[PDB]
Structure 1
Amino acid sequence: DLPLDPLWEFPRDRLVLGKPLGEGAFGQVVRAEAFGMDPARPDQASTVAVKMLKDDKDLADLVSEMEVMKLIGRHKNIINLLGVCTQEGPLYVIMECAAKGNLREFLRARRPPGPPLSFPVLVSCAYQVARGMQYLESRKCIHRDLAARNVLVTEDNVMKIADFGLLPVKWMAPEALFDRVYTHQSDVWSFGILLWEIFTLGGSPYPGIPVEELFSLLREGHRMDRPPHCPPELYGLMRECWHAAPSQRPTFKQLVEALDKVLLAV
């Protein structure tokens, strides 16, 4: 329909698509061979991920999303926007591609047998999501879901958060679960569930509990118990992210330091 941004408008010509990546809600995401995304060498080649429509009000959600990534600008620990294609009809959105796709899945594959993923790599995994979440808050942006299935893993073990903006109940915080309100502190709760999702090497939160009286059990103070081999400072950090009072929940800036003071044990 509408205009063309020289800061992001890419020629469809230099972009040969490829095989999908798999979800969902807003649109389909396919691997795609884009040529010359780095204009230093226009003969270069790389593998980027492209977002399209299936066919819709989803054309408004899709554009509303594209506009927002332009706003926040680049960053390391978030999926960065690379370019777009609105010129000749169908809307393509070109962004960074993480080959080890997805976290939650990143862990359940390197999962040892029951009794590679060393401890520091896992602190690296979380400390990156910490830095990415603080950036989103500072740009006045928000990310509600925040599961280990919303964090993508680059080729180099770099964590890039997926999706942001200005049913999955085990991750939601009380005030969002019952009052339907989301603050920066509701994310700090979700990040704690994420911390637990990692040190269990991709487990399911509150294992073996029906999603339904879960609220009553949290209405008692019963948070999940220290995963095995998780050193107490980390479970100590999860309990803080699970404090019922949001004003007693840590800010993301403090989750950066605590995790950085740990990463520095080395």
Structure 2
Amino acid sequence: GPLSLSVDAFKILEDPKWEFPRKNLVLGKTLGEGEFGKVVKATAFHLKGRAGYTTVAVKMLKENASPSELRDLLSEFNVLKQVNHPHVIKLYGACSQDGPLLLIVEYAKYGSLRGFLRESRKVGERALTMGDLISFAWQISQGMQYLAEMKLVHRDLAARNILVAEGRKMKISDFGLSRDVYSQGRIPVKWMAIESLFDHIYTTQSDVWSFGVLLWEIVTLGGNPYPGIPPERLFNLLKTGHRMERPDNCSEEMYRLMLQCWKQEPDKRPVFADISKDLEKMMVKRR
């Protein structure tokens, strides 16, 4: 079937460009674990023609992995080969010839955005300003603009899936559900667009909805979307035009931007260029 064909392809040593010798990777501490995989910090010797050791993150599966988890890992690898942008997590390669499948990616020293924010606190505890957050959103929007031009739909945009690198640079991560636009879903209900929920449709404009949820997570420094509303009742609330209210410590201009990402009609949402543009304008205008 499709997976056996991808696994067999992958285990062929064909593209030397993305195949990294296992003996030059030294796995370090576990950065984090799910039910079916984990991320581990590592060092890689002579990665991509670089001197000495480069610190990397390594994604791998656990023993109880399903075909679904193996397909998402292989899918992520196949997608990140074609992308390069400063605010998208970089792929360095994979180990496909000795032991388990390992994906080698860019290390971002600070972890997930959601974590980084929940550690934080706002100011006019780690201290962040409105200019900081707007910077964050803008970085993500630039990365999303780039993806949308390559006609990639990310599907899983959320603060849990953005990483924070040195210099507080944002890296969009977790491409295992992405699809090249050019069945029941596995994206959490509370980040999905109404047409995704009712019609199982994903487009860049459903990424723009998810972006509005992610915007809300930023300004609330890691809040949980629609608190006290169970995922199962959200279908109905949204269909009748309820949305999250304007949060505390959030401007009228930011909130408007949010609400527009959540228009029922995908055509009436902004595109990522407009979202970037709004953010560029807010920042010059706050100096």
Which residue number in structure 2 is paired with residue 138 of structure 1?
149
Q: What is the count of residue pairs matched by the alignment?
A: 262
Q: Given the alignment, which residue of 265, 271, 274 partners 1:254? A: 274
Query: Which amino acid is the alignment partner of residue 226 of structure 1?
Result: R
1:192 equivalenced with 2:212 (yes/no): yes
Structure 1 residues 146 and 61, CA gap change in structure 2 (3 angstroms):
closer
TM-score normalised according to structure 1 size:
0.91
Q: Tell me how far 1:119 sits from its aligned partner.
A: 0.8
Deviations 1:36-68 (A, max 9, x none): 32525x23x332101223236344443332122
Deviations 1:158-213 (A, max 9, x none): 11011222261111111111111111111111100111111111111112222233
Query: Which amino acid is the alignment partner of residue 124 of structure 1?
Result: S
Q: Given the alignment, which residue of 97, 104, 108 partners 1:94? A: 104
1:46 equivalenced with 2:54 (yes/no): yes
Deviations 1:112-169 (A, max 9, x none): 699x211111001111111111111111211112111111111220110112222611
Structure 1 residues 134 and 87, CA gap change in structure 2 (3 angstroms):
same
Partners in 1 of 2:24 and 2:232 — Cα distance? 50
Partners in 2 of 1:99 and 1:262 — Cα distance? 28
Query: Which amino acid is the alignment partner of residue 64 of structure 1?
Result: S
Q: Given the alignment, which residue of 11, 14, 17 partners 2:27? A: 17
Which residue number in structure 2 is paired with residue 104 of structure 1?
114
Asked if the contact 2:122–2:129 (Cα under 8 Å) also holds between the matched residues in 1, the reply is: no
Partners in 2 of 1:207 and 1:10 — Cα distance? 44
Partners in 1 of 2:98 and 2:46 — Cα distance? 19
Q: Tell me how far 1:3 sits from its aligned partner.
A: 2.2
Query: Which amino acid is the alignment partner of residue 28 of structure 1?
Result: K
Q: Tell me how far 1:98 sits from its aligned partner.
A: 1.0
Q: Tell me how far 1:89 sits from its aligned partner.
A: 4.1
Which stretch shows the higher mean deviation, 50-59 or 176-185? 50-59
1:221 equivalenced with 2:235 (yes/no): no
1:5 equivalenced with 2:8 (yes/no): no
**RMSD of the TM alignment (CA)?**
2.1
Runs of 5+ consecutive residues of structure 1 not aligned to the other structure:
none
Structure 1 residues 123 and 112, CA gap change in structure 2 (3 angstroms):
closer
Which stretch shows the higher mean deviation, 17-26 or 136-145? 17-26
Q: Where is the helix percentage greater, Structure 1 or Structure 2?
A: 2
User: Which residues in structure 2 correspond to 1:107-256 (within 5 Å)?
Assistant: 107-111=117-121, 116-164=127-175, 165-166=178-179, 168-256=188-276
Structure 1 residues 133 and 214, CA gap change in structure 2 (3 angstroms):
same
Helix, strand or coil for the counterpart of 2:152? Answer: coil
Partners in 1 of 2:32 and 2:12 — Cα distance? 28
Which stretch shows the higher mean deviation, 236-245 or 136-145? 136-145
Asked if the contact 2:156–2:174 (Cα under 8 Å) also holds between the matched residues in 1, the reply is: no
Percent identity of paired positions between Structure 1 and Structure 2: 55
Which residue number in structure 1 is paired with residue 81 of structure 2?
70
Structure 1 residues 98 and 218, CA gap change in structure 2 (3 angstroms):
same
Helix, strand or coil for the counterpart of 2:270? Answer: coil
Runs of 5+ consecutive residues of structure 2 not aligned to the other structure:
1-10, 180-186
Which stretch shows the higher mean deviation, 30-39 or 243-252? 30-39
Helix, strand or coil for the counterpart of 1:149? Answer: helix
